[PDB]
Amino acid sequence: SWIYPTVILCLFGFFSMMRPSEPFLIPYLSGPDKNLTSAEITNEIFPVWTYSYLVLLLPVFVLTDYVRYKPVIILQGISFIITWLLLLFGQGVKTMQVVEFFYGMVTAAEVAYYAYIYSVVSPEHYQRVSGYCRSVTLAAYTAGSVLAQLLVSLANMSYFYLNVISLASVSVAFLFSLFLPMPKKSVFVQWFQDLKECYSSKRLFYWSLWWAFATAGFNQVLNYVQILWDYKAPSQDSSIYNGAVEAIATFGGAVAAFAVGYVKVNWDLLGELALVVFSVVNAGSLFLMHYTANIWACYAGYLIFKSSYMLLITIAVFQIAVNLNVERYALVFGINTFIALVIQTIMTVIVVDQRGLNLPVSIQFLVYGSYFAVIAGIFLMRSMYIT
Ligand SMILES: CN(C)C(=N)NC(=N)N
Numbered sequence: 001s002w003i004y005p006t007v008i009l010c011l012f013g014f015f016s017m018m019r020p021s022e023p024f025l026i027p028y029l030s031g032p033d034k035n036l037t038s039a040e041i042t043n044e045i046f047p048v049w050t051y052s053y054l055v056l057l058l059p060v061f062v063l064t065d066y067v068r069y070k071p072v073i074i075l076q077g078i079s080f081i082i083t084w085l086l087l088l089f090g091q092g093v094k095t096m097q098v099v100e101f102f103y104g105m106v107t108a109a110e111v112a113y114y115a116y117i118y119s120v121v122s123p124e125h126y127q128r129v130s131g132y133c134r135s136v137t138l139a140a141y142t143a144g145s146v147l148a149q150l151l152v153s154l155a156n157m158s159y160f161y162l163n164v165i166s167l168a169s170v171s172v173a174f175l176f177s178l179f180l181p182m183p184k185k186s187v188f189v190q191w192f193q194d195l196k197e198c199y200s201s202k203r204l205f206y207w208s209l210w211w212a213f214a215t216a217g218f219n220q221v222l223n224y225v226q227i228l229w230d231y232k233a234p235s236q237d238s239s240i241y242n243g244a245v246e247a248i249a250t251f252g253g254a255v256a257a258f259a260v261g262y263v264k265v266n267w268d269l270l271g272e273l274a275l276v277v278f279s280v281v282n283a284g285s286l287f288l289m290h291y292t293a294n295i296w297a298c299y300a301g302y303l304i305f306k307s308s309y310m311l312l313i314t315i316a317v318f319q320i321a322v323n324l325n326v327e328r329y330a331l332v333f334g335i336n337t338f339i340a341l342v343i344q345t346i347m348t349v350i351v352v353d354q355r356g357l358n359l360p361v362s363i364q365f366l367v368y369g370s371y372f373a374v375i376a377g378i379f380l381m382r383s384m385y386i387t
Pocket of ligand 1: 099
């Protein structure tokens with residue numbers, strides 16, 4: 001019953017996220033293969049990704065539910081092929097901006113990937129499926145990560161062929177997405193009112209509020225944890241270690257996601273308790289990374305933070321899916337992701353941008369830990385009052 005769509009979507013999300021070039025993305029397109037400058041790379045190529053992500057998330061939650069979640073997934077499969085074909089056979093800054101654009105399309109449609117499996121299975125499985133889905137994606141990343149390192153350490157395989165393997169992987173994901181079962185059929189202000197009825201759930205305007213604010217800080221930590229590690233321990237082994245300490249971290253997240261799916265625990269009443277415990281765990285882990293001048297303890301702190309976040313976000317997605325009581329699975333996921341990315345953009349503007357605070361990475365993770373400490377504090381105080 002639920003097994004067939006779940007296996008196909010897990011295969012799609014595995015082969016679509018098994019990307020060996022993701023770690024060595026910067027070495028690929030800043031070395032002899034492309035000679036993109038580091039000045040033109042993070043100031044002209046990468047910033048296009050956030051804008052494309054925003055302006056393509058705008059249709060994705062408006063129109064994903066109407067199209068029954070498969071054409072957007074298929075659009076991700078095609079955009080995966082186009083993105084890595086353009087990376088693989090593209091030259092110049094203008095081309096990589098288009099690459100970024102298609103990557104933003106890829107992620108805005110990965111939102112639909114997350115919603116689709118809820119669109120096809122009964123709510124009784126919504127827990128299990130949830131973990132499995134997230135797990136496979138994380139697992140895929142870890143696989144790709146380690147595979148990349150292996151292909152750089154035992155085969156001396158260039159970044160070009162890593163991108164070739166990435167294209168081969170995401171092309172198989174397109175074939176798996178072609179086999180996904182089609183879900184069965186279900187002015188401006190009116191639409192807004194519908195949104196009000198969609199978010200009306202007490203435990204879904206709360207879980208969504210956690211989703212909106214937690215993943216922004218999580219993305220920020222993902223982006224600048226490499227910089228934090230480089231600052232804490234300057235060494236010549238960052239290429240084989242840093243990404244390697246984020247390969248197992250992701251693996252931990254995977255297990256954490258697989259923790260939600262496998263075990264049969266009533267999350268409806270442990271949801272608040274688990275939310276507050278793992279949010280204060282995220283805060284303590286982020287403070288652990290900043291305060292200790294030892295990269296071995298900071299690695300464990302990052303692993304704990306990533307695992308607890310992945311478990312919490314799996315719980316959040318599951319609880320939003322079951323308590324939604326409307327078909328708008330991608331509308332809530334899409335709007336949550338869009339608001340989270342808006343918060344991430346605003347806060348990365350204030351804290352790390354030159355025109356803002358321009359805080360170094362020494363205080364950046366103190367700020368991130370304070371921010372998460374604030375999310376944990378709001379949920380902790382709200383839960384304490386209710387009781
Ligand atoms: C160019 N590609 C494929 C990216 N992953 N880009 C990115 N902004 N990380």
